[PDB]
């Protein structure tokens, strides 16, 4: 009976296994836009994408991971709030069974058909699992999809799907470029928080970027045919895998921008 996003293992019972989903840093939460404040201190971020090298797509029966050769300094986040550099590991999203949800963060409780994930490291800690021990060890890029024109940068993610349909499944996926992933303006709201899946380790710098990307409904519609089970188990598509927002508590949003 492991954690998923079913009425019986959703969201609202990961705190059994998972106490800190109840925690003082939780993620996604609502981003309210008139309560943001702008901070002139916020340097522009800076993604340095150029040099990443990607492997391999995995799903992992909660969703799938573009996973990233990490074993040297290429792919980093820096600048905005953070201190010091974070190495680009892997990235996935979260999606809607109808293009209305999606998103684990909303915009004044605007939820968004899809939301990527962009999970960076920081080398100060020399390895994830270290990094993921420590307050400040990830630095999460979240960029909203709404459904629109099509991404072109996005067709070769939706073209391999149809190979890894069922949990454990895997596809090797090199040379893909994730700057085609990325909206024009890096302007952002930013807030301390955690990963929005089990564990929900209190760990994340959250860089929420304010413009969405525009996704086909035939893109999204392919992220759909998806499956949580296995192969040869009954069929789950996987859809409605995000994490409502969390009490904001004792923490302030800064908007990188006026
Ligand atoms: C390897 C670490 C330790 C761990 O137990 C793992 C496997 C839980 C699942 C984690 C993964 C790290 C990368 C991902 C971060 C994501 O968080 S998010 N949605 O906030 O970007 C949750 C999904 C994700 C695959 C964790
Ligand atoms: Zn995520």
Same mark, same amino acid.
């Given at each position: 009976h492991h954690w998923g996003?079913?009425?019986?293992?959703?969201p609202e019972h990961w705190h059994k296994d998972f106490p800190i989903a109840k925690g003082e840093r939780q993620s996604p939460v609502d981003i309210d836009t008139h309560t943001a404040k702008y901070d002139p201190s916020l340097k522009p971020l800076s993604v340095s994408y150029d040099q990443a090298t990607s492997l391999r797509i995995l799903n992992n029966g909660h969703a799938f991971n573009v996973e990233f050769?990490?074993?040297?300094?290429?792919?980093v986040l820096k600048g905005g709030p953070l201190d010091g550099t974070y190495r680009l590991i892997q990235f996935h999203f979260h999606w809607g069974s109808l293009d209305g949800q999606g998103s684990e963060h909303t915009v004044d409780k605007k939820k968004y058909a899809a939301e990527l994930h962009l999970v960076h490291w920081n080398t100060k800690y020399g390895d994830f699992g270290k990094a993921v021990?420590?307050?400040?060890?990830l630095a999460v890029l979240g960029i909203f999809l709404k459904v629109?024109?099509?991404? /072109?940068? #996005?067709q070769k993610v939706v073209d391999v799907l149809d190979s890894i349909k069922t949990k454990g499944k895997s596809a090797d996926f090199t040379?893909?470029?994730?700057?085609?992933?990325?909206?024009?303006?890096?302007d952002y709201w930013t807030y301390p928080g955690s990963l929005?899946?089990? /564990?929900? #380790?209190?760990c994340v710098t959250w860089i929420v970027l304010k413009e969405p990307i525009s996704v086909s409904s035939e893109q999204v519609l392919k992220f759909r045919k998806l499956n949580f089970n296995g192969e040869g188990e009954p069929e789950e598509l996987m859809v409605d895998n995000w994490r409502p927002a969390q009490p904001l508590k004792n923490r302030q949003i800064k908007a990188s921008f006026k």
């Open positions: 996003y079913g009425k019986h293992n959703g050769d990490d074993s040297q300094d290429k792919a021990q420590q307050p400040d060890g629109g024109s099509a991404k /072109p940068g #996005l040379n893909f470029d994730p700057r085609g992933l990325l909206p024009e303006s890096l929005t899946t089990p /564990p929900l #380790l209190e």
